[PDB]
Design a protein around this ligand. Sequence first.
Ligand SMILES: CCCCCCCCCCCCCCCCCC(=O)OC[C@H](COP(=O)([O-])OCC(O)COP(=O)([O-])OC[C@@H](COC(=O)CCCCCCCCCCCCCCCCC)OC(=O)CCCCCCCCCCCCCCCCC)OC(=O)CCCCCCCCCCCCCCCCC
Ligand SMILES: CCCCCCCCCCCCCCCCCC(=O)O[C@@H](COC(=O)CCCCCCCCCCCCCCC)COP(=O)(O)OCC[N+](C)(C)C
Ligand SMILES: CCCCCCCCCCCCCCCCCC(=O)O[C@@H](COC(=O)CCCCCCCCCCCCCCC)COP(=O)(O)OCC[N+](C)(C)C
Ligand SMILES: CCCCCCCCCCCCCCCCCC(=O)O[C@@H](COC(=O)CCCCCCCCCCCCCCC)COP(=O)(O)OCC[N+](C)(C)C
Ligand SMILES: CCCCCCCCCCCCCCCCCCCC(=O)O[C@H](COC(=O)CCCCCCCCCCCCCC)COP(=O)(O)OCCN
Lengths: 145, 64, 71, 71, 375, 111, 99, 121, 85, 293, 60, 104
Amino acid sequence: MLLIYIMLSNIVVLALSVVLTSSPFMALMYSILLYLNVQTILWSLGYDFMALIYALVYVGALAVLFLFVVMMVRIQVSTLSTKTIQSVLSWLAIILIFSYGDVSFSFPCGAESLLNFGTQLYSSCSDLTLLNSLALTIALFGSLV
Amino acid sequence: SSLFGRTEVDPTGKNTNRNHQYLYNLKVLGHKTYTRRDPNELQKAQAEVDTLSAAGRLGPLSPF
Amino acid sequence: RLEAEEVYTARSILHPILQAEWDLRYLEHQRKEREDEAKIMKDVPGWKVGEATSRRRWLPPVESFDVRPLI
Amino acid sequence: SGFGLQSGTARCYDWYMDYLKCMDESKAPMITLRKQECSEWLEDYNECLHRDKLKLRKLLIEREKNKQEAA
Amino acid sequence: MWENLWYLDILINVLIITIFGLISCSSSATKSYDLKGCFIISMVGGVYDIPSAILWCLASLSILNFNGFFASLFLVFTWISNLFAMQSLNFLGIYLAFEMQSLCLLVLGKITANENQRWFAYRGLLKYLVLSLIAGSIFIFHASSSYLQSGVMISDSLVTYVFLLFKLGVAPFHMYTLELFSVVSRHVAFVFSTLPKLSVLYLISNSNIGSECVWWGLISLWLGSISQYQSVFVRSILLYSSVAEIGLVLLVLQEGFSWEAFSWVSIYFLSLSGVWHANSKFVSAISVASIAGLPPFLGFIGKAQILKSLVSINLGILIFSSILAATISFIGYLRLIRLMYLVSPVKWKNNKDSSFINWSTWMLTVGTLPMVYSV
Amino acid sequence: TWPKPINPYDVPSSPAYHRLQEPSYPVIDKDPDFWTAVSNVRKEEWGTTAAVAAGTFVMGYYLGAKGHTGKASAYFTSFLATKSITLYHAYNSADRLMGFKENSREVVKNV
Amino acid sequence: VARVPYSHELYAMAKHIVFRNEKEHNAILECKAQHDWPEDCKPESEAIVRATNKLFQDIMQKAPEEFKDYAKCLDWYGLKFSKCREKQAAFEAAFPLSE
Amino acid sequence: LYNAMTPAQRYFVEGEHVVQAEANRDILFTQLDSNSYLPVLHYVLVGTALGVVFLVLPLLIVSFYIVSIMYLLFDIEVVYLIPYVMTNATEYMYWVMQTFVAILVGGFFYEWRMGALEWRE
Amino acid sequence: GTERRPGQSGAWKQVDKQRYSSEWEQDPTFKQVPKNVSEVLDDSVSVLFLTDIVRGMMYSASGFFDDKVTILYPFEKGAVSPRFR
Amino acid sequence: MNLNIIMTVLPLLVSVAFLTLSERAVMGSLQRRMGPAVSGAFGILQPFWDGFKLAVKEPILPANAAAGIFYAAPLICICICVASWCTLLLTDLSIGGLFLLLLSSLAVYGVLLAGYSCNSKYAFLGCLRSVSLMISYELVISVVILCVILETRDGNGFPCLNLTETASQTKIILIPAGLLFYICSLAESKRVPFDLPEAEAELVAGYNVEYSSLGFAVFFVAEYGNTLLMAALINIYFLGKLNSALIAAIFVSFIWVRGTLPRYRYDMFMQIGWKSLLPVALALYLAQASLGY
Amino acid sequence: YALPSYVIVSAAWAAGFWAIDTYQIYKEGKPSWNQNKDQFQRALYRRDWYLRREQETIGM
Amino acid sequence: HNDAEFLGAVYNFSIRSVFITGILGAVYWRRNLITMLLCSEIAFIACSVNFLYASAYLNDMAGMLFSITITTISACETALGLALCVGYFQSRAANEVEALNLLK
Ligand SMILES: CCCCCCCCCCCCCCCCCC(=O)OC[C@H](COP(=O)([O-])OCC(O)COP(=O)([O-])OC[C@@H](COC(=O)CCCCCCCCCCCCCCCCC)OC(=O)CCCCCCCCCCCCCCCCC)OC(=O)CCCCCCCCCCCCCCCCC
Ligand SMILES: CCCCCCCCCCCCCCCCCC(=O)O[C@@H](COC(=O)CCCCCCCCCCCCCCC)COP(=O)(O)OCC[N+](C)(C)C
Ligand SMILES: CCCCCCCCCCCCCCCCCC(=O)O[C@@H](COC(=O)CCCCCCCCCCCCCCC)COP(=O)(O)OCC[N+](C)(C)C
Ligand SMILES: CCCCCCCCCCCCCCCCCC(=O)O[C@@H](COC(=O)CCCCCCCCCCCCCCC)COP(=O)(O)OCC[N+](C)(C)C
Ligand SMILES: CCCCCCCCCCCCCCCCCCCC(=O)O[C@H](COC(=O)CCCCCCCCCCCCCC)COP(=O)(O)OCCN
């Protein structure tokens, strides 16, 4: 329970660190740590395959593309530090306003089965998977040109 | 399907408008409906179980 | 798969028994809880112990012993 | 979907199907009226989803227990 | 399995045409007319109703004026996405279809830009991308809250209504059209300002996505008219006209007048075809007259449908605003006529590729009297 | 409650799309195969298939000749349109066998 | 408190239960199919639990060592029947199934 | 260590012995904690600590972008193929998988034909 | 051996020449099209099964077991002739 | 914690040290040379010298780089190796092999941060070349694993990739995929046939050369540890129950195949992975999802 | 000579394998601690644990 | 009194904070395009996690499917957007100084 709470609470700090830092490379590192913490949150809800998917697709592949771009477009963004006290508390107040008093539901634990998930992906929800494949094909054809 | 569906007319006219979600859930998932056992039936069966237990014919509730 | 059919047959045999003994334990625990609830709500007017939260269907406990967080 | 994440159906699929069946039975000319006629089944479905009434009952029992203990 | 075959045939068709084009890629046929005809034939297997037949008609008329196998393939992808937007039954279908269409828009915008046009076209595509990400993220977050609260995914909700307001391009959600379509190819702007709307209108009509609020259509009407009157550049005039008209059509569609909006979208496609594919001044003049709603052409019928639906619902503020904003927009259309024949000598490119432009002008002039029954 | 046992090899599965309709007409075949549906395609439908094949051959040749590949475009277009229309006819015949569509000729021809 | 033998014991006696205790098993399946509330199914649940415990006991007297060996071997091999064939044959020989 | 909080999770077993046993238990896969990733996280911390000890001891005394995109997309495609191999498939699940792979192979053929698979660029 | 395949080359322009022209079949050193089914299988298995690689592997593996040639410099010294300067 | 973590970690360190010794002993064998013999008499004690001496060398202060990332890369490699081995030996995870695939996709980070530390325009391209190799052959490994789960079924009949269950039976069906797994494992450890680095790295293109004393030790140790993990995976998937001799024999086979093979150019091995290995692995994945259940 | 370092590697990992196997079989109580468990098998282990704790409470 | 209720409230707070940090973070703290897309990815991950949470809550598979759909669509969008960013940076004129930082 303490471990679950620590992860749920750490997600917000790892999200704040991304926007606050002025270096695009450092924000990517913070985002990778955020993605791992999201894997860890999904473990508490009972998902292993889905939490694996988040790490494989995002940490494994997407971050590599982001960092490839970041080195290619390398720019001097160490111009100045504008992180005055007045700005940071304003950001925190905005965040508190948005994330307060929303409807909360008891924390669930749900065991998943990739047998059932596979059967549904390829029998009943087969319309979904083929359209996702079409979207991937669109992205491939568009990005390569 | 679960996500997508198209709509066609019936030349015969026998089939009519019904909720497509309800029909789809009946066909793919199915509806489980349960009754409630009448008290007099339950009392007789429970008394029979207790009577056999008192005679010693039935086994223990816990093995150890 | 012959092994798998053997195991499935065995599991389908044991499941009714396991379910029945879970229901019995649940029933005894629930009567204990209702006794304590009636003891607490003796003072309060207009309180009925054992009120049906669902009119028709039984509401199963959301929490179960079987599902435990991986972490 | 309602497929159930392990096997079978979702934990509250049958309550929603009860509500849908009751909406199918009605003869009201608009969906809104039909929902007005079948509201009680929807209250069962919301009860199974979130168990708010049972939570309130537990809260009242806890509050009275604390009041008794303090006295 | 037979019901699945109807959808599967469209896939198999598209895949084999794709691989045939990839194999038969040569300089001898850069304009692949044969694959265009094959794509048009393949899209006939997706026609099941009148709205789907309208989707097919507009898709084919669009694919005629795209050049190359690759752009025609992405127009076919847009057609598939639109066909599934019409058939979507819950949140997931709506989302999958519409962001697939957004991906097709990004690709089509990228591939129709020259090297000298990259600086502005890629900026507009990027700005469109970020705004679309805002819209989709808000949609899916509220969808998660709704799916948690209700236990079911129902496409009759405020969340999908606001998301479809973003897709339509009304009141506070029309800026992505102004930024993107100003910097992209004229055909890309034409096909993606008309064809996407039909699927959204069908989804709204069939899935009961209507709100009691009339502020957004009113704001769309007034803002579009006034900004059209104040805009110096011609592309902005045409772009703001669509905002005003789609706000008015949104007000009509909420009240259940599906037939009239389905006729309006087709008449608007035909009317906009000539001004966007400007090759002749006279064709553009007839197109601009049709967009204004002017009586001798079919555009009068399409606007008349919407206005006739307005008087039925009997909302006075909407009618008063409609009259005044229509006058304000008419001033901008008159600016367009003035620029062509009454300002300076005009010389344009001799782009003799009027595939359906002459047919569209003929249809605008002719079609008024056959369709007079509608109004 | 207790987990229900699952048999890994026999897990209930179903096709993605469903036609929600009770058969109005008699059911010759509850689950027709592809060849059963093709064998029940009417003669007029086959003539329509042949006409579409010829027309698409002519059109494919006309369009491909503008790109200096007339023969290949003609054959590809013919195959494409013929396959699509044949699947459409087979779907109609399968629906007729299932009793969803009118089947008086079918029931007479194959008892 | 309602209780049935531990897992490995239940597996070792699984085949015998349907051969010997058919009546209660069918009754409980039918009643659970009909009624959702656990109170409605209480007599049949009691019957099947008591019958299963009785079967455990009468195996304990007729074949004490053979049942113990089969249960221990099942627990050792992670509840897998295939690796336990020899002990299964010896136990079934000692305690004949279906009487 | 996840601890059950309700009687139903504790198998309606009464007393405080069970809560004490659960709280001070060891992570044993045969026992309550099966398919648990908590040992993996403990392994992660142990490795990090060992690395830190080594680190601190001495102190005292276009084509790449293209391959990244293709890797991302083919990786997602294999992500969808993973659930299929995890099921005892039927004929129709099989043919859906065949259509999926057909689309992936069409993309791969496009890659091969356009010369992207060649890394000259 | 000395014979070369149309596909295998180290220069991009030469690869382009051989990919799009058939002047390599005029040249004697290159290997000609198999012209029989069995020859196609032979060449295909040769390329796909990494045959030439294994042949070098055995001859290199002869190195493991052959008599090592080495001198323990402190204990043994290399032969030095009288003329050595 | 558990005492098993010790019983996994310590053998790993000892094994990696003697792996480094084995490499040069086998090189002496190919080249009619002998194992190092002045370090001691037995030679058991040779790699320990390199580690302990490397502790001695005076530290160099970091230059024109962010300190955090430069420290981060060694810690990443040392974390990944420990997690991989302790999830190969001490876990019951139903999809554990897929977790190992995930942990192998995180090895791209160590090289990539080490390259970013350089901040040389040439080093950008070199580190991109190395990571391009690793990801390109990770794809084919993923397809091969899809092949492996296809014959991997447990006694209960449930498909899984539990390492003990795939270890339980030896399937000669899978051997065609094991050859591709062996080639890709050579690629992922940057062995000579795919050792694009050594040629580029002699001039400072950019690699763990920047790291000097203890950071450099852990990288090289992690390289051998990953090679040994690949050997263990080849054993456990395709060759039955885990056997120490088989693991070390696969490692020696790596050294032998390296010795008998020259290196490939960047476009060459990249074209091999995409146009040769991937179609064959998709053809075998078809052959396995389509040899049936 | 290749074999001595080879055998050091082999023997070291053999010893580690034996140590982990014996340790877990001593703690877990069965060689099948690592084997794959589905939902039914997991819930069965959990009920066994809870029922054993209940038996300990009842006995004392 | 209930740990699950407390954990549910904490999760709601955390996930909402992550969403708002993703959507408005890069624009409030004026950043380059590359950070904007990374924060958009963060927000999409927040929504997908909410859907998985709902699936666990209701024992339903719809959210699992919608989450894999989010992963695919977000990855495709990010790939195309990064393509546009690289093409945009390659066409920059010498006088242009912070081309990527339009938000300045
Ligand atoms: C020849 C006989 C035609 C007469 C009747 C047509 C029906 C039979 C179809 C026969 C085909 C003829 C096509 C004509 C119409 C097309 C409709 C249609 O096809 O489906 C409808 C038909 C049944 O739908 P339905 O009759 O509409 O009724 C359903 C409900 O009522 C729900 O549908 P609903 O929407 O109609 O509901 C009633 C509606 C009432 O709606 C109406 O009153 C309709 C009014 C008529 C509008 C007509 C214009 C529509 C434009 C589409 C053009 C057609 C393109 C053809 C595409 C298909 C080509 C075959 O009430 C409403 O309120 C809804 C709003 C409707 C929209 C508002 C109308 C405005 C339209 C825009 C006008 C604007 C002006 C534009 C300029 C005009 C100036 C002159 O479906 C079929 O019969 C099967 C379709 C199969 C098509 C192709 C399959 C065969 C080939 C398969 C293999 C293909 C590959 C091989 C290729 C081989 C060749 C190489
Ligand atoms: C634009 C739409 C996007 C989304 C599309 C979703 C809709 C498509 C979903 C289906 C995807 C393809 C799945 C196959 C469709 C047709 C089903 C089928 O042909 O398989 C048969 C499987 O049976 C067969 O008919 C075997 C012959 C199959 C021959 C091939 C037909 C399907 C080919 C699929 C195309 C993939 C090929 C590669 C793609 C180019 C159905 O299974 P059963 O009949 O229930 O099992 C057989 C048992 N018994 C006959 C006794 C009842
Ligand atoms: C009741 C009708 C009223 C409702 C209206 C809607 C229904 C529409 C019914 C009539 C539609 C007529 C559409 C006319 C389109 C005009 C024809 C056309 O565009 O031809 C192009 C075609 O251009 C192409 O790209 C050729 C590729 C496609 C070729 C046609 C494909 C045919 C596919 C088969 C369609 C059959 C229907 C399938 C079954 C229904 C040639 O022009 P260009 O060479 O590009 O430039 C012209 C230059 N200039 C005039 C200035 C000299
Ligand atoms: C009158 C009935 C019999 C007609 C004879 C044709 C039957 C042949 C089988 C069908 C083939 C296609 C039909 C021709 C239609 C279009 C073909 C075409 O595009 O014509 C010319 C060029 O395009 C045109 O000139 C436009 C012609 C438009 C159509 C004019 C003919 C109208 C009647 C033909 C179709 C009638 C129906 C066909 C049978 C149903 C093709 O150029 P090339 O590719 O170079 O082939 C010529 C071969 N060679 C130069 C080597 C001698
Ligand atoms: C023909 C039978 C008909 C039935 C059809 C079946 C098709 C084959 C299926 C069998 C599956 C096993 C295949 C083994 C993997 C080979 C993959 C393709 C082979 C290949 O293309 O050759 C080269 C790839 O191997 C390489 O050269 C990579 C570099 C290897 C260096 C490391 C070698 C390690 C030792 C070999 C593995 C041994 C494992 C045990 C020690 C490419 O090069 P290319 O240019 O010639 O081909 C391109 C010419 N267009």
